[PDB]
Structures are given as C-alpha cells and as structure tokens.
Amino acid sequence: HVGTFENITAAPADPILGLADLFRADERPGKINLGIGLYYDETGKIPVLTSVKKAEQYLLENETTKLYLGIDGIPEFGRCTQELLFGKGSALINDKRARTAQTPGGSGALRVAADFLAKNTSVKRVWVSNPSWPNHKSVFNSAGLEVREYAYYDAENHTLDFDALINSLNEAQAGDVVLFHGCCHNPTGIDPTLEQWQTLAQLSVEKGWLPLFDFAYQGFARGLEEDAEGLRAFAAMHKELIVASSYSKNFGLYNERVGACTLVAADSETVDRAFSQMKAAIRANYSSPPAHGASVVATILSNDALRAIWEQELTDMRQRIQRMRQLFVNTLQEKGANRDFSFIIKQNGMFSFSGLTKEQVLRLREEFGVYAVASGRVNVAGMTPDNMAPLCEAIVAVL
Amino acid sequence: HVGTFENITAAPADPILGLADLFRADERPGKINLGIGLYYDETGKIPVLTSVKKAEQYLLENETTKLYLGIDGIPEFGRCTQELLFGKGSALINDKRARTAQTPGGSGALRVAADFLAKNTSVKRVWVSNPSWPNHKSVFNSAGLEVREYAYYDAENHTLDFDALINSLNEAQAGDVVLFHGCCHNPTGIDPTLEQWQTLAQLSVEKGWLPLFDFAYQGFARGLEEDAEGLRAFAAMHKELIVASSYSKNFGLYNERVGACTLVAADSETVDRAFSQMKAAIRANYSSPPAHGASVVATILSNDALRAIWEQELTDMRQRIQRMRQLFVNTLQEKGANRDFSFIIKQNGMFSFSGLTKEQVLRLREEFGVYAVASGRVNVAGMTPDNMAPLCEAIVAVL
Ligand SMILES: Cc1ncc(COP(=O)(O)O)c(C=O)c1O
Ligand SMILES: Cc1ncc(COP(=O)(O)O)c(C=O)c1O
C-alpha cells in the first residue's frame, strides 16, 4: 500500500531547543550557552538546590508506595500553590473559588488550560504579547485556538509601550483570552508597574477578557510576594481567571516537570463544575501527573526549616543574576562597546533583549561559539565572572 | 459581563478513578477494593520494588543536575525499551527503523500518538476492541479521531470470539489504525494465541491497516519475551507500526508516569522525518518528560545486577496473581457457588472478567463493601489470603 508515514514533512527546528542541540555538539572548548533559560552558578554548573537534595533524601527513606496520584495531583501541593499565588489570607481561598491541578511543568499547565477552553467553552482567540515565549503559539494552536498578538515592547527606548499595548487590546472582544506574564517577561524582562497592572485589571473587567497568567519566574524579579502583585490585583477584581505556573526554575527542578494550572470562577459551585471538565482533559492526556518533583516542592513548602533554606537559595539566585547584569554592562563599556547598554540594568529575570540583530547573533555562534536566541535574547543567568570577558569581547567584535 | 464558565456541563464520573474516590470515602470496616489495576502483595499493600529503591538511592547520590531532558527523553531509556519490545538482535533495531520517545506513562504515549497522527497523517479512524480500557476512546477523541469498535470477547464460552473479530474488522480501511493489546487484554484477560497473532498480522498487511499496540503489562502473562511474541509477529511483516508501552505496572512506578511511544517506519530516513513531527507534538504538550521515573527504569535495565533482581520481582508478582486466580476459583466453589468460574484460570494478567451484571456489581459495593468496576472487571491482584473468604461470600450472595 501507499504508506502512512511516507509523505510526512520534516519539522522545523525549535528556536530554543534546536539551539541547545547545536551547543551540545559544538566541540570548541570556549563555547558559551546564553540560550535556554537555565540558572548557572558562579562556577558555570547547573546545580541541584540543597533544599531539593534534602527533600529527595526524606522521600527516599519514607516513601512506601508509588500508587497513582489523583488526576489533579497531591492536595498539599495544590494548597501551597494557591497560597504562593494569592496570599495566605486570600478571599479566593476562603470562598473556595479556586481549584488547582498539578501538571507536568508550566508547559503542561498551558496545554491543559488550552484543551480545557477549546473543548468546554466558546473561546476562539488567545491574545499573546509581541514578543513572547516562542512556544506559546504552538501550544494554543495545537489545541485549536487562534492566536493574536498585541504590542508590548518599544524597541527604540527599550521600554514598555503602554499606549500601544492598550490600543492593540481594544481589538480583543469579550470572551477572548489575554495572556499576561506574571513577572520577568520572556524575552524582554520588562514588566508593568503595579499602577499599570491595576489599569489593565480595570480595563480587563470592563472589556470582558478572560485573563490567563503565565507564572514561570515567581521570585526572580523582586520577591515571592512582590512578584505576585500584578496577579493579585487582577484576582481582587475578576470573577474568572486562569493561572499556569511553573516550579522548574525557582526550584531548579527542570526535568522533573513540576507545574500547576489553577482555575478561578465566580463561586465554588461553578469552579467545581468547570474543574470537572479540566480533570477530564487531563485524563485524556497523561491521566495523572508525576509525583517525584511535586512531592519535593510540597515537602519544602510545608516544612518551615526546608522552606527557609529554599527561600535563601532563591534569593541568592535572584541576586547573582542582578550582579551579572551590572557586571555585563560595565564589561561591555570596558571592552570598547560605544552603545549604551544601561537599559539591561532595568530588566528583570533571567533574560534581556540585547538589541543584537539576527545576523549578529549568527556571527556570535559561528565565529565565537557564543549561543544566543536569534531574537537577540540572552540568558544573563548563564554569565559568570569567568566567561564575562570572552563573551563581551565577542559582542563588541560584531557590533 | 456573562461568565465564560457558566455554560459548562459537568463531566461524568470516571468509570475507574471515580470508583477509587468512593472507596476512600466508605466508612464501613472490611471494605475491599478490586477496582483500579494496582498490584498488591500478600499483606494488601502496594509496595515499592527493591530494585526501584536501589536505583533511587543511586540517583540521589550521583545526580548533579536537573537540567531538562531532550524532547524524547533519556537516550538509554529508548534503546532498552526497543530491546524489550523487539528483541536484542531485531532487524528493526539494526536497520534503525525505530525511534522511541519517553512519555508520561502509557497514557501519555497514546495521546502523543493521537496528536501526531491527527496533525501529520490522513488517519481519521481508530479501531478499538469491545470491551477495552475505557480511556482509549477518550484519548483518541481528544485529538478529533473517530473511534469504532470491533468484536472481541465471547461472553458465553469466555474465550476470544475470533470469527466475530475477523468479520467486525471487515470495514477497516487501508490507512485506518487498529489498536491491539500486546498481552493481558484489559478487561477480559483473553489474548490471541501465537497462531491467531500470525493470522492477524497477515490480514493486517493485506488490508493496509496501521497497527498500534498498547503494551501496558509486558511480563504479566507468561514472561517478558513470551508476552511480546504477538508484537514481533507483526513487526516481522509490517513496514509501519506504533507501540505505546508503560512501565507503571511491571516496575510498580505508577505515579512517576514512565512510558514510551515507539515509531516504526519503512527505513531510517522515513522514521527520522516522522519522529521530528512527533517531537513537535510533544513540544506543544508537556515539552519534555519527567526524568525520575525513566531514570530508575534505565538504571535497572542497564545494570546486570539490578535487572536480575527486577526480573525476579516481576516473576514473584506474576506468580502471586496466578495463585490468587486458583484460590479465587476454589473458594467460590467452597462457599457454595453453582456457577462455574473455571474460565478465570485461563485469563492473563491482573484482571478477571467475572461476568457479573452492573446490578450485581452495585449490590456488592453498597451491600458488602466490595468494589469492582461496573463492567464486572475485578482486580485479581487485589485479592489476598485474608480477604478471599469474605470476598467470595459476598459474590455468592449476589449470584
Ligand atoms: C514564559 C514561560 N512560560 C512557560 C515556560 C515553561 O516552563 P516549564 O519548563 O515548567 O514547562 C517557560 C520556560 O520554560 C517560560 O519562560
Ligand atoms: C491497556 C492499558 N493501556 C494504558 C494504561 C495506562 O497506563 P499508565 O499508568 O502508564 O498511563 C493502562 C492502565 O493504566 C492499560 O491497562
């Protein structure tokens, strides 16, 4: 017969993971990886946090069974997740307006939400920032939802174009979904101020949007509580919203796939009715989530001694990135860059829009073995005191 | 504005997992759970295998990072999976005709296959046995694939209705997917003989079906190699096929979500092209799979010492279930059953298709605290020397 796989077309390279494959195969010893968002320590390693090793040790000696978790995962994991997102004494929690499912990573939480909406509501369009995480469009298209873009970044002044953002979103109709980065906007690193959040929250309720918050970097901007102010302004004003969160990065648990999808509705009867369909969409996907990574997170967040250790480790990560931002800017000037890169100090999180062209990013990789994303996004957390000088010499050589 | 979640219809109760929730709530003492397919030991517990504990200690001591796995997971995990399925010296492997993706459980493997087929092929129809695992239809429907049923079980002789199976698949077109259970058919426990497998393999190639094997219980019928005879009869004749396999049960790693989706095509260049689109379907779902569970399996299968331990543990599990099958039939007679349950001994795996009616199943639960699936499926692996007598007295009471 003809053959079913014979005419399949090869898939294009992932703009992020394809770069990581090239880096791994590169044989040059001085190669530098500033692509995929991984936290490196001063020594260039990607370590397991001490709080995580201690929690895994507890699990190894106390686990007696591997029997399936519920569709929505470990209950304590869900409860602790809502506390982090909304606060200890939140009204959503007391009113029982929120339900949380443990998911395989933030990516898994985005697909679950996308499947949930495409199959149980009349949602048709998702509004995503321009630029944004490249995988956002793929997740929502694969679920059958259209993806529209709204303006965000002023490339001239390296700032948030709040006028163009609101003008773009005026085309978003009621019932549409609008995606917001909770903090540390990927890839620009520019987040709204609290006042700008409150403006979007009020505009969101009067326009009829369904907010969808992507929360992959809580604690990397200013702090655990501070980074959730934007979400908590929306939460104090909307009847419905969705939060897809990730523990991959603030716990360094990338490959264990630890995330959550939290559903908020007007009242407890509606959220439970909606959550039953979300569990059905999970059942038809991976059935139940992996336990190891979420058990680690739950063990840490529920033990005051481990949590204290983890909160300090997260502070050290946040502050090392800030030190590298300063060192990055100073070193560029020291190596002969005549452009002003001071805007990089004002950006939060792991990434920064360097302003380099696709052709310059290509030169960096081929000629100097410095790997950045074609959009000019660089992982500041991949910079160390040892690789800063060769890295900045290469950037100056291509300007 | 009117809420987006108001017109959502509540999802029905899951036929398997909704049962486990009723069991956890039942306050009556002596309740017995013969529902969800978990392996219990002689004492009524769901333990962690010794080999799994050994492997987990090795990972705790030697893991230095939680860096993301590739989209397709741990390479060694895929190689050992192919050896398990096809044999150490298979032509499929030497010709490099197979590619394997690590997935979250067999469920995740099935969903990945469904998404891959729906988006990259002209497949529109999947044929599933009647009866089958209830979640099969949900997974393929989630991708928009039509699911048709073919006849399988002779509920009169308690055997494979091979004549009806052949006739009911007459309308299966070339390019349709036909789903086969590799061994330990769920729920009936009746598998095709080697001669019947070979007959199906010949018919499958003549009609141009795309075979999809669900392999969740390798090693629970007769043995690791013996249980794969049917798959290898198909593999020797077909240019293309798909295998969703699970390690949830033969390793007791249920909640770590350890599975694999294997893709087989005519040649190495074709499978590579097709596999790139499978990875794209994974990227738009959970991005990359969880490491812990698959790392355990790869460690055991690669270490000669641990593998010998695991194989003996799998033999112990298989043999206890077979003794419980014999004891179940003997005790039913002892307790006054006039219906002949000898067919139980001929069935393979954890599950016994008892032939009880939905009314009798509901009566066992509400009246005696014995929990089985409404189809009459009972988990033999949940029977113990301590609960056998009350269980059989309950059944006899409703016959
Ligand atoms: C904005 C954003 N959303 C989602 C994700 C996915 O996170 P995870 O690795 O937990 O799937 C990432 C990074 O991976 C991200 O930067
Ligand atoms: C036939 C069959 N396929 C797939 C599965 C799913 O297994 P997993 O837990 O790996 O998702 C099961 C049981 O759970 C099964 O019986």
What is the structure about, briefly put?
With 399 residues, chain A is α/β, with parallel strands linked by helices. Chain A has helices at 17-25, 50-62, 75-86, 91-94, 105-120, 135-142, 162-169, 194-207, 229-235, 268-283, 291-302, 304-334, 358-368, 388-398, and strands at residues 32-33, 98-103, 125-130, 146-151, 153-154, 159-160, 177-181, 210-215, 241-246, 259-264, 351-353, 370-371, 377-379.
What does this structure look like?
- Two copies of one chain form a homodimer.
- Chain A is built from 14 helices and 13 strands.
- Chain A starts with 16 loop residues before the first helix and ends with a helix.
- Helix content of chain A is 43%, strand content 14%.
- The first copy, chain A, has 399 residues and is an alpha/beta fold.
- Chain A has helices at 17-25, 50-62, 75-86, 91-94, 105-120, 135-142, 162-169, 194-207, 229-235, 268-283, 291-302, 304-334, 358-368, 388-398, and strands at 32-33, 98-103, 125-130, 146-151, 153-154, 159-160, 177-181, 210-215, 241-246, 259-264, 351-353, 370-371, 377-379.
- At the A-B interface, helix 2, helix 5, helix 6, helix 10 and helix 11 of A face helix 2, helix 5, helix 6, helix 11 and helix 12 of B.
- The complex binds pyridoxal-5'-phosphate (2 copies).
- One pyridoxal-5'-phosphate (PLP) binds next to helix 5 of chain B.
